[PDB]
């Protein structure tokens, strides 16, 4: 299992949970793409362990804040995909958000 | 000259020479059932040396294990080591209590000869960093990254004599003693900080109290919604595309900043011309902080109180929501309150976790539930909290320091200690001359001179 | 049917295919294949079978890389054709050997093979017997990746007997994989009909080309469903080249699969392999289970029923994972759940439940609103013992839960909550929603029923629904009633016990349970002041 | 990058040890034993993930003794591969040290 | 050079790849066949390279699968002949594409193709040239997994720069990728001798069939690495298909490979792929990394000189790292050291190195012991610009070691420490045996040298040598000398510093060095009492 399998499923959420609450600013996403990670994070032992082995995500925290003190080491990985799926999300909420948009036109 | 300044008096010795016993542990065969069986006698692993002083067995090892292995029963009030597990090379050390145990290959058991070396003495030698450095001139080493038994018997150490010995292994041993006991104390007290927390909210001082829709409460107090009471306002973030924002010298604080503590100041700041463009709203001292995003542990509340002198002063991001009091209010009360878990529960009966989640709704925060204690009581009850968590910071410093004076204590010690003197007792008729605390001090220096100047009769005295 | 001198006898040729090149999860296949070959010649009649310039004895006659290159064109030249009859066997059928010189070393080993597992006749149904139970060893071993479609045989079973599929009743495999559930539910039908000999001829060439339907992405692993079914006497439809169908579940092929009676599989867990969800569903996801769930919601006819084998995952995920959770129990009626243990499976750090539930309700089959009111809920994973190689899963394992059940496959059957097998009296009871309100000793009971408002309120719409912790320890059980009640007054009470044992051991007090009643009636009316 | 990638290399490096020091008992296997996981661990990044996402080897420890207390996450997962290594091959001692000792005959 | 309109347009017939079945991987492979078959025909002479029934017109007017099935056999009739030269070009080549609209819709694709680039002539040179380049962007691009085989140009043009191969060398590269070693290595030779045209006929002969040698594991890459060679006129041995040979350098194979003058490689990071190190070396290992370097020293002609790229691990691996590190230091002698920075491999977290060294000594070129003296160190990594697409490497960061490096090939020209090149004298210096008794100037320079005693003492035979922190940070630059000379030392001093600070911003004393020296003066003394 890859990051990209994980990062593409988030995307495709995240695209559905706009279309159906007609999402139209980067101001009112918080909630949608961190809902979108929630759903795309591996659940099995060595689905997460896999993600971590795969292309485009590292063990660092970019916000420490989002990193559990804990001695639970799977809690800690997940929390990271999950941080990373949400800073990537973000990197796409204008283009996004502006196909929703241009998706009709008369 | 030696491994260290050395005293006239002291010799070094050979841990050999000094050590009755030195000899490894072995393992038994893990396969057979009857070795565990039924087990009386405890099994040590490398574990348990590192976990505190060794009072507990995390496995057991029978006596027919033991009767089938080179494992060998320890006597009490014995020093044990690791072998195995290390920064390459270091070793554990652990004194056994509890009656004779036995251990794996991984721990070696020491035995200390009667009257010629305590056990107390050597534990702290070997906890010494001395210690360390000693055993680290082997080196990694190849195929043996380990402390060989044999090489800890060639170690050198200082030998004082016996009856010093003990009085500077006591010593030790009362401020590790002390340091447990600050510990203990310091432990105690957020427990305690957190009954008050409980009973001085909702019961405040008064003695006569009423039902109310917010539980039993004070009758002199009333109740009213957050909304009633304080403004909420919400805040955005500036676009990071622009770098006329970046330029900065205005705090802006994140949550992470928040997690973080109290904050005066911020990592990352934004501009005036930000705010202005923007409308971010500004936020004096005094005001309360609250955090908005990335949730808590879901659906929960964080709180901070910001810092200025008239000098600075906070704006934050859309991440994080303020709070402004219309008046009568004494914020940092209001912010204990919000932190306290009863708050917590009230906010996460009020909503589980829904689609809206990781978050706190305006609505949510206005229509909370709130007392409304007089002002000059809010100022008691705060000025008790704050000074509490002052208390405990300070006897967090004080232990730091107590550590550190060990520290020194241990490295001037262990050179004097090791002198005869320090068995000697000063030379006074009369024991007010100690007894003064700058007399004690003069008549060592008299002393010192005086048994100085008897030296200078033969120089082996000095030599030796 | 164990393993016997006859999969000793295939696993040696194995070693040519080792050492060949063949991954251990291919060996089967390849094995198959040639077999096949080798048997139509053993017929004697592969004249009527095999096209001239492509049998046993061109291939076998061959050498080196004449040979294998050989193989390579006989492989491609027998999967394309009008005799689609041989056409099904080797279609998208390739060999992975690479060593010239192991190819020859196990053309001609098997080919002095003997019918040494076989019988009074020609005994085909061994081969491919034995060749099913070989694959299975792979199927169990973990480096092969093959575990991906493996089912514990017993689950299979009891999944089958819990259904209690009838003739003309159609019976689908979204996820056939090797076709395991069909090949179970089609031998249920034939114990119970003497082999169809109790049907007329009609019905016989529904429940032969009809009754069951697959689906596989994988075209090797469709493959070898294939051969299953071929060998079991399932011919399915020769437009799609037998009951197996290749293609994409989440997919046109997907949609394009006929409606069932009956639902019984084990869709892939993970993110799954290459399968593009490029068909619209009622509640769009990403997740490749919850897309499952909801193609196996629409194939269902009205009154269909279904078993579906499903990861922790669908439970309690949030996002479309609530939405859909809730068109399930709105279009059907769910009304057992059966939560797995772990290590049964060929992974292991794995959660797994089985779903049963009805396409709209018995009454009224058409229904498209609030299907589902009770759910209950089987607890046969938490304190159990850990399963292995060690301590294998068998059928007696699942026959309690069988037995609760009922005999009706609709779950119709009067059920009452109460049922403590595998020490769920001696399970720690867990402080939350489900044990709220409950007496002790349902609240350690395996077998509980919880209501759609429940659901709905307290679990907010999700069936990742638990109440026993079953500890690990040796505590001494005495405990006041109401103490027990209460998962979570068991803390408070529990901690008065601690001090009450170092006193009784000053005491000196025999182990007695007249003892230990009159320091409780102290201790106990203490810590209620 | 496999786990038995790992143990194939440890366990190949336990046999040349053997034989360079004519080891012939288990109580002093402890030390070859030991150097033999520190040469098969991996160094990079990706390949210690890929390893802890692979068949053979869990995230709990066996001895809480051999696990550091510290805030890396890295140095805990090649820790437990350290000591997964060592408790492998630990049971293949005696069979080992049998191999050996059975490989010449006058 | 730079992809162009050509590289563009070979790009838009990999759109056909990519929905055929082909990965970005093998994009080149599959494009790389069908143009030559082409182009075969396009020459006018098909006749005399490619044999009857299988030329461009047999494929191109085909359709379908009878196309997929005919080309897969037309790969294999290809790859085993006794006109080898051809075969060379086929050998163990086979296509991925599994989708036959896809390569009906490849062939002519390209059929229709120009010579878009070409020059007087026809340009064959062009498409291998651009074919290279867009091999490149896989080789690049981080998905392909193709990385593995790619290694900067600055780099190697670097590495065969300072090797300066001269004519009647034979130029060895145990790892050859796709030749970009060898290829850099003849691209050099021919720039000193008017492209051969300086020597004599039978030299010619030699730089055409025996100056350069390779081996390549995997059969794929191995091709492509022939073409590479063949249109860049290195021919190689006819016996072995030509300069790259196939096999494996832990094998057989690498020890039946011929002595070399010269060896620069790259040899492949991590485990590798499937390389069973069925070969017995000086010290048996289980790295592979260890083994090549073991390989290297033995193929080494007495006097020999390499460069080889290696990962740290190789530096500090304990264990049999050790013994072979020693091995190579007695039985080498290695000269330089070269610290390579971070991402400026497809890769990513990997830290990288470039040992130099001659077998034996020049003055001695069989001597056995001692070889190794003293060791240059130069640290290119530590401290410098984060590279990238946005950062990229270029033959400007190699500049400055080249310089200092020497101009004889054996690193034997006059060297003197010192070298403080992107910003080597603001970054911060370690406290460690390297910059013990070491100078304020010296221990923030690139470039220093380490005696072999010295390596043997405090480093324990390990050459995991490294001496600069480069802390990022913005801190003033004042420090008495003997402050800067103890790196450990600033600590302290630096603590003082803090406190000072504090004092000045109460006295309100200007910003100016006067005024810092005033304080300094009475505080830095102060620490020293």
């Given at each position: 299992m890859t990051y990209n399998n994980v990062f593409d499923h988030a995307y495709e959420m995240l695209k559905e949970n706009i279309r159906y609450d007609d999402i139209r600013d980067t101001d009112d996403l918080h909630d949608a793409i961190h809902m979108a990670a929630d759903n795309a994070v591996p659940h099995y032992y060595a689905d997460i362990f896999s993600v971590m082995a795969s292309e485009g995500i590292d063990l660092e925290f970019e916000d420490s804040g989002l990193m559990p003190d804990t001695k639970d080491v799977i809690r800690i990985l997940q929390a990271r995909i999950y941080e990373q799926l949400t800073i990537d999300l973000w990197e796409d909420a204008e283009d996004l958000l502006n196909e929703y948009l241009e998706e009709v036109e008369e | 000259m030696s491994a260290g300044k050395l005293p006239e008096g002291w010799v070094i010795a050979p841990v050999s020479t000094v050590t009755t016993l030195i000899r490894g542990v072995t393992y038994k065969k893990?396969?057979?059932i009857n070795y565990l069986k039924d087990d009386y006698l405890p099994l040590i692993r490398a574990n348990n040396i590192q976990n505190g002083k060794f009072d507990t067995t995390d496995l057991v090892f029978v006596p027919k294990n033991l009767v089938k292995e080179s494992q060998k029963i320890s006597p009490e009030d014995i020093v044990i080591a690791m072998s195995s597990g290390s920064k390459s090379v270091v070793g554990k050390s652990a004194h056994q209590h509890l009656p004779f145990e036995c251990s794996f290959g991984a721990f070696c058991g020491v035995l200390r000869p009667e009257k010629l070396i305590f056990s107390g003495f050597i534990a702290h030698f070997t906890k010494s960093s001395l210690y360390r450095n000693k055993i680290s001139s082997l080196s990694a080493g190849a195929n043996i990254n380990n402390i060989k038994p044999a090489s800890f018997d060639l170690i050198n150490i200082p030998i004082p004599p016996l009856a010093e010995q003990k009085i500077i292994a006591e010593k030790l041993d009362t401020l590790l003693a002390q340091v447990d006991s600050t510990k203990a104390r310091f432990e105690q007290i957020p427990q305690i900080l957190k009954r008050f927390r409980q009973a001085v909210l909702g019961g405040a001082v008064n003695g006569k109290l009423t039902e109310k829709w917010r539980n039993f409460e004070p009758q002199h107090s009333v109740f009213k919604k957050l909304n009633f009471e304080s403004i909420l306002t919400e805040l955005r973030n500036g676009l990071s595309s622009k770098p006329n924002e970046s330029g900065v010298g205005h705090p802006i604080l994140r949550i992470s900043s928040v997690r973080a503590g109290h904050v005066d100041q911020n990592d990352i700041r934004f501009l005036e011309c930000s705010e202005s463009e923007l409308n971010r709203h500004k936020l004096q001292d005094g005001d309360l902080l609250f955090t908005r995003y990335n949730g808590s542990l879901e659906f929960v509340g964080v709180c901070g109180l910001l810092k200025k002198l008239q000098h600075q002063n906070l704006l934050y991001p859309d991440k994080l929501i303020r709070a402004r009091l219309?008046?009568?209010?004494l914020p940092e009360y209001i912010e204990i309150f919000f932190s306290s878990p009863s708050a917590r529960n009230a906010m996460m009966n009020c909503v589980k976790?829904?689609?809206?989640?990781?978050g706190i709704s305006g609505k949510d925060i206005k229509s909370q539930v709130v007392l409304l204690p007089p002002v000059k009581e809010q100022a008691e009850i705060v000025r008790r909290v704050e000074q509490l968590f002052a208390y405990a910071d300070t006897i967090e410093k004080q232990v730091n320091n107590a550590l550190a004076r060990v520290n020194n204590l241990t490295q001037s010690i262990l050179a004097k200690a090791f002198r005869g003197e320090l068995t000697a007792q000063w030379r006074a008729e009369n024991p007010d001359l100690i007894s003064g605390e700058n007399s004690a001090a003069a008549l060592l220096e008299k002393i010192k001179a005086e048994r100085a100047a008897s030296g200078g009769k033969k120089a082996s005295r000095k030599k030796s | 049917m164990n393993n016997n001198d006859l999969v000793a006898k295939l696993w040696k040729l194995c070693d040519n295919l080792r050492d060949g090149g063949v991954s251990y999860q291919n060996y089967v296949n390849e094995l198959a294949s040639l077999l096949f070959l080798k048997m139509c010649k053993e017929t004697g009649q592969e004249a009527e079978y095999l096209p001239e310039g492509y049998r046993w004895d061109d291939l076998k006659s061959r050498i080196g890389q004449e040979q294998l290159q050989f193989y390579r064109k006989m492989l491609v030249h027998l999967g394309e054709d009008d005799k689609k009859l041989v056409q099904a066997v080797f279609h998208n059928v390739s060999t992975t050997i690479t060593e010239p010189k192991q190819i020859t070393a196990l053309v001609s080993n098997m080919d002095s093979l003997d019918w040494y597992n076989g019988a009074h006749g020609k005994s085909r149904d061994d081969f491919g017997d034995m060749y099913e139970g070989l694959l299975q060893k792979n199927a169990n071993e973990t480096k092969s990746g093959a575990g991906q479609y493996f089912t514990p045989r017993p689950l299979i079973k009891t999944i089958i007997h819990l259904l209690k599929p009838q003739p003309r009743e159609v019976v689908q495999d979204p996820?056939?994989?090797?076709?395991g559930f069909l090949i179970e539910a089609d031998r249920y039908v034939k114990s119970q009909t003497n082999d169809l000999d109790d049907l007329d001829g009609d019905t016989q060439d529904f429940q032969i080309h009809r009754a069951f339907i697959g689906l596989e992405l994988v075209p090797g692993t469709r493959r070898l469903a294939l051969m299953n079914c071929l060998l079991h006497?399932?011919?399915?439809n020769l437009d799609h080249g037998g009951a197996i169908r290749l293609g994409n579940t989440l997919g046109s092929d997907g949609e394009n699969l006929p409606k069932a009676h009956i639902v019984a599989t084990n869709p892939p867990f993970g993110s799954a392999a290459g399968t593009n969800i490029t068909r619209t569903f009622v509640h769009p996801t990403s997740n490749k289970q919850l897309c499952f769930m909801q193609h196996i919601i629409e194939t269902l006819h009205p009154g269909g029923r279904a078993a579906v084998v499903v990861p922790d995952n669908v439970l309690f995920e949030g996002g479309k994972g609530t939405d859909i959770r809730r068109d399930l129990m709105d279009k059907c009626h769910l009304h057992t759940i059966l939560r797995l243990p772990t290590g049964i499976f060929y992974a292991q750090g794995v959660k797994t439940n089985v779903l049963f539930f009805t396409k709209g309700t018995v009454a009224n089959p058409n229904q498209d609103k609030n299907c589902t009111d009770d759910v209950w809920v089987y607890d046969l994973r938490t304190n159990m013992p850990s399963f292995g190689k060690r301590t294998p899963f068998t059928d007696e394992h699942l026959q309690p839960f069988e037995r609760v059940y009922g005999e009706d496959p609709h779950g119709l059957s009067p059920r009452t909550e109460g049922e403590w097998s595998f020490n769920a009296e001696e399970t720690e009871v867990a402080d939350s929603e489900e044990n709220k309100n409950t007496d002790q000793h349902l609240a350690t009971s395996r077998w509980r029923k919880f209501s759609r408002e429940w659901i709905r309120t307290a679990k907010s719409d999700s069936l990742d629904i638990s109440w026993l912790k079953d500890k690990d320890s040796i505590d001494?059980?005495?405990?006041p009633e109401p103490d027990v009640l209460a998962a979570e007054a068991m803390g408070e009470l529990v901690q008065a016990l601690s001090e009450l044992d170092a006193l009784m051991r000053e005491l000196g007090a025999s182990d007695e349970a007249d003892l230990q009643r009159q320091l409780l009636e102290e201790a106990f009316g203490g810590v209620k002041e």
């Amino acid at each position: 299992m890859t990051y990209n399998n994980v990062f593409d499923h988030a995307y495709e959420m995240l695209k559905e949970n706009i279309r159906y609450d007609d999402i139209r600013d980067t101001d009112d996403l918080h909630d949608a793409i961190h809902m979108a990670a929630d759903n795309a994070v591996p659940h099995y032992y060595a689905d997460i362990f896999s993600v971590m082995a795969s292309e485009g995500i590292d063990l660092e925290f970019e916000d420490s804040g989002l990193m559990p003190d804990t001695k639970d080491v799977i809690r800690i990985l997940q929390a990271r995909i999950y941080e990373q799926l949400t800073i990537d999300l973000w990197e796409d909420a204008e283009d996004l958000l502006n196909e929703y948009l241009e998706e009709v036109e008369e | 000259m030696s491994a260290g300044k050395l005293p006239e008096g002291w010799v070094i010795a050979p841990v050999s020479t000094v050590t009755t016993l030195i000899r490894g542990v072995t393992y038994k065969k893990e396969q057979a059932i009857n070795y565990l069986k039924d087990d009386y006698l405890p099994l040590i692993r490398a574990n348990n040396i590192q976990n505190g002083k060794f009072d507990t067995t995390d496995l057991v090892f029978v006596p027919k294990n033991l009767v089938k292995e080179s494992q060998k029963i320890s006597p009490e009030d014995i020093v044990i080591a690791m072998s195995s597990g290390s920064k390459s090379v270091v070793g554990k050390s652990a004194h056994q209590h509890l009656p004779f145990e036995c251990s794996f290959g991984a721990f070696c058991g020491v035995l200390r000869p009667e009257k010629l070396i305590f056990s107390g003495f050597i534990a702290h030698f070997t906890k010494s960093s001395l210690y360390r450095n000693k055993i680290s001139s082997l080196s990694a080493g190849a195929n043996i990254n380990n402390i060989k038994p044999a090489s800890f018997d060639l170690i050198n150490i200082p030998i004082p004599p016996l009856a010093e010995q003990k009085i500077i292994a006591e010593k030790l041993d009362t401020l590790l003693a002390q340091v447990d006991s600050t510990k203990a104390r310091f432990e105690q007290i957020p427990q305690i900080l957190k009954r008050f927390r409980q009973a001085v909210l909702g019961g405040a001082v008064n003695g006569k109290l009423t039902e109310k829709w917010r539980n039993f409460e004070p009758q002199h107090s009333v109740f009213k919604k957050l909304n009633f009471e304080s403004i909420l306002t919400e805040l955005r973030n500036g676009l990071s595309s622009k770098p006329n924002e970046s330029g900065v010298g205005h705090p802006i604080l994140r949550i992470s900043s928040v997690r973080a503590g109290h904050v005066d100041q911020n990592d990352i700041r934004f501009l005036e011309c930000s705010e202005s463009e923007l409308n971010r709203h500004k936020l004096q001292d005094g005001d309360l902080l609250f955090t908005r995003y990335n949730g808590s542990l879901e659906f929960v509340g964080v709180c901070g109180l910001l810092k200025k002198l008239q000098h600075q002063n906070l704006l934050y991001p859309d991440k994080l929501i303020r709070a402004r009091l219309t008046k009568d209010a004494l914020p940092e009360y209001i912010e204990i309150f919000f932190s306290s878990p009863s708050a917590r529960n009230a906010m996460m009966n009020c909503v589980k976790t829904t689609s809206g989640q990781k978050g706190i709704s305006g609505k949510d925060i206005k229509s909370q539930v709130v007392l409304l204690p007089p002002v000059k009581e809010q100022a008691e009850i705060v000025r008790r909290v704050e000074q509490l968590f002052a208390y405990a910071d300070t006897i967090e410093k004080q232990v730091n320091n107590a550590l550190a004076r060990v520290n020194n204590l241990t490295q001037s010690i262990l050179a004097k200690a090791f002198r005869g003197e320090l068995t000697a007792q000063w030379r006074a008729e009369n024991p007010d001359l100690i007894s003064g605390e700058n007399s004690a001090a003069a008549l060592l220096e008299k002393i010192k001179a005086e048994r100085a100047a008897s030296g200078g009769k033969k120089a082996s005295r000095k030599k030796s | 049917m164990n393993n016997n001198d006859l999969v000793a006898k295939l696993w040696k040729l194995c070693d040519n295919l080792r050492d060949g090149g063949v991954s251990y999860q291919n060996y089967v296949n390849e094995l198959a294949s040639l077999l096949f070959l080798k048997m139509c010649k053993e017929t004697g009649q592969e004249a009527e079978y095999l096209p001239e310039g492509y049998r046993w004895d061109d291939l076998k006659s061959r050498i080196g890389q004449e040979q294998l290159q050989f193989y390579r064109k006989m492989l491609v030249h027998l999967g394309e054709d009008d005799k689609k009859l041989v056409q099904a066997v080797f279609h998208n059928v390739s060999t992975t050997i690479t060593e010239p010189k192991q190819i020859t070393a196990l053309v001609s080993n098997m080919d002095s093979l003997d019918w040494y597992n076989g019988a009074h006749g020609k005994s085909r149904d061994d081969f491919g017997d034995m060749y099913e139970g070989l694959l299975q060893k792979n199927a169990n071993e973990t480096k092969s990746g093959a575990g991906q479609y493996f089912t514990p045989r017993p689950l299979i079973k009891t999944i089958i007997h819990l259904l209690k599929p009838q003739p003309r009743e159609v019976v689908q495999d979204p996820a056939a994989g090797t076709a395991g559930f069909l090949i179970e539910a089609d031998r249920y039908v034939k114990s119970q009909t003497n082999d169809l000999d109790d049907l007329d001829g009609d019905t016989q060439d529904f429940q032969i080309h009809r009754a069951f339907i697959g689906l596989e992405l994988v075209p090797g692993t469709r493959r070898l469903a294939l051969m299953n079914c071929l060998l079991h006497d399932i011919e399915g439809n020769l437009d799609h080249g037998g009951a197996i169908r290749l293609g994409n579940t989440l997919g046109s092929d997907g949609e394009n699969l006929p409606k069932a009676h009956i639902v019984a599989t084990n869709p892939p867990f993970g993110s799954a392999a290459g399968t593009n969800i490029t068909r619209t569903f009622v509640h769009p996801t990403s997740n490749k289970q919850l897309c499952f769930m909801q193609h196996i919601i629409e194939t269902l006819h009205p009154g269909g029923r279904a078993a579906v084998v499903v990861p922790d995952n669908v439970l309690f995920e949030g996002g479309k994972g609530t939405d859909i959770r809730r068109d399930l129990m709105d279009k059907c009626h769910l009304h057992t759940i059966l939560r797995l243990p772990t290590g049964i499976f060929y992974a292991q750090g794995v959660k797994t439940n089985v779903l049963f539930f009805t396409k709209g309700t018995v009454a009224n089959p058409n229904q498209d609103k609030n299907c589902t009111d009770d759910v209950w809920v089987y607890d046969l994973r938490t304190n159990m013992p850990s399963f292995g190689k060690r301590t294998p899963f068998t059928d007696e394992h699942l026959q309690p839960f069988e037995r609760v059940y009922g005999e009706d496959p609709h779950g119709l059957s009067p059920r009452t909550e109460g049922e403590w097998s595998f020490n769920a009296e001696e399970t720690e009871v867990a402080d939350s929603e489900e044990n709220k309100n409950t007496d002790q000793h349902l609240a350690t009971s395996r077998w509980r029923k919880f209501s759609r408002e429940w659901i709905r309120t307290a679990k907010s719409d999700s069936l990742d629904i638990s109440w026993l912790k079953d500890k690990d320890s040796i505590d001494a059980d005495s405990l006041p009633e109401p103490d027990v009640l209460a998962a979570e007054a068991m803390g408070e009470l529990v901690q008065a016990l601690s001090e009450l044992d170092a006193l009784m051991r000053e005491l000196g007090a025999s182990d007695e349970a007249d003892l230990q009643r009159q320091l409780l009636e102290e201790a106990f009316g203490g810590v209620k002041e």
